[PDB]
Amino acid sequence: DRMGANFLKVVNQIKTRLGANPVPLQLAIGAEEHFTGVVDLVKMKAINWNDADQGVTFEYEDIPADMVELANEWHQNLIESAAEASEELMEKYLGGEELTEAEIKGALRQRVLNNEIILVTCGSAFKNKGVQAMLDAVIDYLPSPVDVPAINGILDDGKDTPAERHASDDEPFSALAFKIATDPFVGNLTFFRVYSGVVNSGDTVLNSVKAARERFGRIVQMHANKREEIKEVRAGDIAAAIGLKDVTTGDTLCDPDAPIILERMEFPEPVISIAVEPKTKADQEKMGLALGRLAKEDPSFRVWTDEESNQTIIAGMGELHLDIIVDRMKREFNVEANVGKPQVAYRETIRQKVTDVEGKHAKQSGGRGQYGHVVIDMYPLEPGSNPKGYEFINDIKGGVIPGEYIPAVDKGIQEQLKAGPLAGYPVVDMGIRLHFGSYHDVDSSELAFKLAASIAFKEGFKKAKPVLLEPIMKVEVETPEENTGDVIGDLSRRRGMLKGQESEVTGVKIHAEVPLSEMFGYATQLRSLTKGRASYTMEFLKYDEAPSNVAQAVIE
Amino acid sequence: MKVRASVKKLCRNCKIVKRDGVIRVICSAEPKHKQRQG
Amino acid sequence: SRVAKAPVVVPAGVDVKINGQVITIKGKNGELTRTLNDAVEVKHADNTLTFGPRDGYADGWAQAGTARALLNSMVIGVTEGFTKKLQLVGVGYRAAVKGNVINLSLGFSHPVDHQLPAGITAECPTQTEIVLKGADKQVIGQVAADLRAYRRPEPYKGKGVRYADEVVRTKEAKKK
Amino acid sequence: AKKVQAYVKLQVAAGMANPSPPVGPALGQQGVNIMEFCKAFNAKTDSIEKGLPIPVVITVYADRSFTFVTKTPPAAVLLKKAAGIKSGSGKPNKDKVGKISRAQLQEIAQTKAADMTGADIEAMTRSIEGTARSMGLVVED
RNA sequence: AGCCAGGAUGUUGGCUUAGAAGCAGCCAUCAUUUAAAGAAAGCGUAAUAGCUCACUGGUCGAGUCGGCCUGCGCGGAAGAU
C-alpha cells in the first residue's frame, strides 16, 4: 500500500538478481490506495477486505472486469508450473485435461521438498489486507514436521549410518537446544522445540555431546511473553527446557539408551571488539562476573579478555549488538559502564632524540645538602632482538658513582620507562644511556640520584616526540561490486598497507595490512561504505606505528 | 553566492558576465568558485 | 560581422506580414510574431531574409543580432517543433497527461495539477518520461523549467526532475 | 587501424594469467570475456621463458567483438634484461656503469624488423642509445 | 569560435614497483613518423576504462588576439524624529 510498489516487478526481479524461478500466485487489484483485492489465481477469486476494521470480512468474488486479461495471461503460466514439476502433468497441459485447484497443488507441494520455486503473495500486514489470505498457503505450501524427513540421528564415531527416525510418538525422545535466554527468576531459560516423541514432567535429560548430567524441571510456555507452565510436552511444541546445568549451542536433549546427535555447524565469529570499563571499583567486582549469564546466552557475543591490563574487552559481530548488551546491563543488571577503547599495545617510542637532560637535584635531606646533578643522554629505542625492555647503559665517567648508588639512578629512569608522559603509555624497549653521574660523599644517597634521573627522563620526552609502537593486523574485506574503489581509497586514509585486489565468482576480495591502533570504529565505517554488504576475515601479521607528535604541545 | 571585494578568475573554466552591474563569476561544475561583488 | 554574414532563408509554407516594425509570421501550426525594437531594418528581399541595423542605434548590431537568430528559429519551430523530454527520477514519482494538464507526484501531502498554456501539446510515454511539444523556443523552455524548479536535481542521490540531455553532478556522503 | 572508440597498447609479462588490476580496465572497456584473452595468447606463450613484459594492443568492433595484435617485447626492457637489474635510472648523467655495443642492439632489432614496420633499425639506434643515457649506462664498440 | 575529428603510437617511463602504470612526487626531459601528437594540465581515480588540451588533419571562408599607456565610468559604499 505504498508508492512505487509494483508486484510484478519484484517477483520478476528475482529471475535477474537472485537467479531463482518464482512463479507467483496471488496477484494485485487496485492502484495501491484504493486497493481492495488480492488475486488468488488457483481458485480465480478476489477477496474483499475490511473497510478499515481490524478484521471483519473475507468476501470472495470473481475476477473483476478491470483485470480480465491479465488474469488470463498469468493463469496459463500457473498451470505450466506442474507440467515441468512432475512428468505426468506434461501430457495433460497439451492434451487439455482440466487443471483444477486441487490437482495442481499435489505436484507443487512436492516442488517444495527440492525448493526450485518459491510461492509469493502481495498484500498489507498493517492495513489488514492479505493476512487472513496468507494462512491457507502455509498448510499447503510450507512443510509439516511429519511430512519432512524427520530426526536423523547418525551414530557417534563407529560408522556413518544416517537413520531416519519416526516423526510420531513411537520413537525415543529427541530435541535440540537453541535460543537459550536468561531470567532473574530461575537463571537460564531455553526456547527449545521438540521434533517427535513425548516427555513427561521430571526427567534425567542429558546433553550427550559434552558429557554432562541435567534434570528436567518445570517447563513453561509463552505467548512470547507470559509464563504458562507446560507440564506435558507433546511432539512438536516449543517450550522452555528449564534447569539445564550446562548447555551449548545445538546439542541434544535426549534420554540415554537412545539415538544421539553430535552436530555443531557454522560457529560464527563476533568481529567488532570494544572494551567495557567499570564506573566504580565496586562495579568491576560485578562487571568481572558479567560474562557469566550474558555469554552463556549466545555465541554472537564474545569477550577477548587481555592478559595484562585486565580490562574486559568484549567482541560482537555488530556494534548494533554492542549497543544492546550495554543496555541489557543498564536497568536490570544495574550496571554503569564507561565504554572505551580496546587494549592496543601502546608502547611509546621516540621520533626525535634529546641531546642531554640533567636531573636538577638539590635538597639537604640527610643533614648536609644531598646533591645529585646527574645527566642522561636519550639513546634511540633499542631495536631488533631486545628481550629486556629496560636497557640502561650506565656510562659512569671513570666509574665515579659507587656500586651502592648505582641502583639509585637506575630506579629513577626505570620508573619513567614503565610510565608515559601522554596517558601512562610505557616507553619500554627504549635503550637509555647515562651521560654523567655526579657523585659526592655526605651529599650522595639513593633519592640523590633517583629523583634527579626521574625528572631527567621525562624532560627528554617533551623534546623527543614519543610516538607509538603499534601492532598491525592482516585485514581482509570481501565486497562484491565495483564499490570497493571508494573503500580502498578510504582505506588509504588509515594506512591499510595494500597487498592486491583479487576476485571471486561474485566477490572482489581486497587484501590489506591495517594498523590495530587504527581499528577504532572500523566496523561502523565500512558498514557505511559497504552498506553492510561484507563478509570477511581478520588475522594478524606485522607490527608498525601510528602518528602522534604529542610531545610538541599536548604532552605537558 | 559568496560575496567579497575581489573577483579573481579562479577555476579553469570560469565565465565572467556583468549581470545587473555587479559581477558574478560563472563556473560549470564547481559552485564553490562563484563570487559576487567588485 | 558573423551575424551580418548570416541571412535567413524562409521556405514555402510560412508567410510573413511585414507591417514594418511588427511582423506576424503566418506559419504551419501557429502564429509566431515578435514586435522587435526600432534598431532593425527588415526586408524579405527575394526569398532569403536580409536585415540591417538602424542609424543612431549602432548597438543594434546586438539588437538585430538577436533578431537574426530569432526569426530563423520561428520559421522552423512553427512547422517541425521541439521535443523537450524530461526525466523524472523520484521515489514513487509519476507523470501522466490528460488534456493540457500534467500531474505532479512530488512527495507532498497534496497533489499538484497545473494547467499548461497554449502552444503546448504535452505527452507522457511513461511515469518518468514526459514529452512537451511547442512552436516558440521560449515557451518550450519556460513551461519545462518551472517543473524542474519544483524539484531541483539533488546532488547527493541524483534525486529530482531533470532534462533529457542534462547530466547532473552527484556527490558522495563522505562523513556518515 | 581504428579510431576514437578504443586503442591502447598495454600488456605486461604473460606468466600471470589473471589480468593485473591496472591492466584490468584496458580489458574493462568493451565487454570481454576475460577468459578469452587468457585462452588466445597461451598457445604461443609456451615458446618463451617468461619474465619480460610482452606488449599487445587492443582494438574493438561493433557487437561484442574485439581484436588484438601480437608483437615482440620492446628493446627498452631488453636493455635491462641483459644488464641484470630492471631499474637503473636513478641519476641519468651521473652514473657510468654497464656496456653493450651496437651489435646486441641490432639483433634485438631484427626481431623488431621481423615484427613491425616502424621502430626501424638505424633510427632507434640513438634511442636505444637514448634509453641508455637516461638509465646511466655506457656504450662503446 | 563550433559539427565531423584522429587524440598518429615506442613505454610498464623508472625509482621503491604494493598502485606510486603520461594523471603522488624528485632526476632525465630521446623520440622510431614528424601534413596531426608531449617520456604530458585537470577531471574519471588505488590504477585505469570515460572526457579533453595538445596540431585543429578536413569544413566555414573573413578579420582576429593577448598585454602596455591614458579619457572618463561600475563595483568597494552600512546608521540612527
mmCIF file with all atom_site columns, N, CA, C and O in Angstrom, chain A residues 148 166 286 506 516 554:
data_model
loop_
_atom_site.group_PDB
_atom_site.id
_atom_site.type_symbol
_atom_site.label_atom_id
_atom_site.label_alt_id
_atom_site.label_comp_id
_atom_site.label_asym_id
_atom_site.label_entity_id
_atom_site.label_seq_id
_atom_site.pdbx_PDB_ins_code
_atom_site.Cartn_x
_atom_site.Cartn_y
_atom_site.Cartn_z
_atom_site.occupancy
_atom_site.B_iso_or_equiv
_atom_site.pdbx_formal_charge
_atom_site.auth_seq_id
_atom_site.auth_comp_id
_atom_site.auth_asym_id
_atom_site.auth_atom_id
_atom_site.pdbx_PDB_model_num
ATOM 1  N N  . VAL A 1 148 ? 8.140  -33.987 6.439  1.00 0.00 ? 148 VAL A N  1
ATOM 2  C CA . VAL A 1 148 ? 9.552  -33.818 6.109  1.00 0.00 ? 148 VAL A CA 1
ATOM 3  C C  . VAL A 1 148 ? 10.314 -35.090 6.452  1.00 0.00 ? 148 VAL A C  1
ATOM 4  O O  . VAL A 1 148 ? 9.771  -35.971 7.140  1.00 0.00 ? 148 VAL A O  1
ATOM 5  N N  . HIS A 1 166 ? 11.357 -41.853 13.381 1.00 0.00 ? 166 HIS A N  1
ATOM 6  C CA . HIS A 1 166 ? 9.934  -41.619 13.185 1.00 0.00 ? 166 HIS A CA 1
ATOM 7  C C  . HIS A 1 166 ? 9.546  -40.230 13.683 1.00 0.00 ? 166 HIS A C  1
ATOM 8  O O  . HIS A 1 166 ? 10.070 -39.727 14.682 1.00 0.00 ? 166 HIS A O  1
ATOM 9  N N  . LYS A 1 286 ? 31.323 -6.681  40.072 1.00 0.00 ? 286 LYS A N  1
ATOM 10 C CA . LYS A 1 286 ? 30.111 -7.191  39.448 1.00 0.00 ? 286 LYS A CA 1
ATOM 11 C C  . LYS A 1 286 ? 30.154 -7.062  37.928 1.00 0.00 ? 286 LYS A C  1
ATOM 12 O O  . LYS A 1 286 ? 29.239 -7.540  37.248 1.00 0.00 ? 286 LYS A O  1
ATOM 13 N N  . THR A 1 506 ? 31.544 -14.045 -7.347 1.00 0.00 ? 506 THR A N  1
ATOM 14 C CA . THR A 1 506 ? 30.608 -12.968 -7.040 1.00 0.00 ? 506 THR A CA 1
ATOM 15 C C  . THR A 1 506 ? 31.255 -11.815 -6.281 1.00 0.00 ? 506 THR A C  1
ATOM 16 O O  . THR A 1 506 ? 30.661 -10.733 -6.213 1.00 0.00 ? 506 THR A O  1
ATOM 17 N N  . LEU A 1 516 ? 46.337 -2.031  13.956 1.00 0.00 ? 516 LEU A N  1
ATOM 18 C CA . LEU A 1 516 ? 45.370 -2.364  15.000 1.00 0.00 ? 516 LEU A CA 1
ATOM 19 C C  . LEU A 1 516 ? 45.056 -1.134  15.840 1.00 0.00 ? 516 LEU A C  1
ATOM 20 O O  . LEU A 1 516 ? 43.942 -0.980  16.353 1.00 0.00 ? 516 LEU A O  1
ATOM 21 N N  . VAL A 1 554 ? 50.598 18.948  23.262 1.00 0.00 ? 554 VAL A N  1
ATOM 22 C CA . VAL A 1 554 ? 49.600 18.128  24.019 1.00 0.00 ? 554 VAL A CA 1
ATOM 23 C C  . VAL A 1 554 ? 50.232 17.624  25.322 1.00 0.00 ? 554 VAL A C  1
ATOM 24 O O  . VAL A 1 554 ? 49.643 17.875  26.394 1.00 0.00 ? 554 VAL A O  1
#
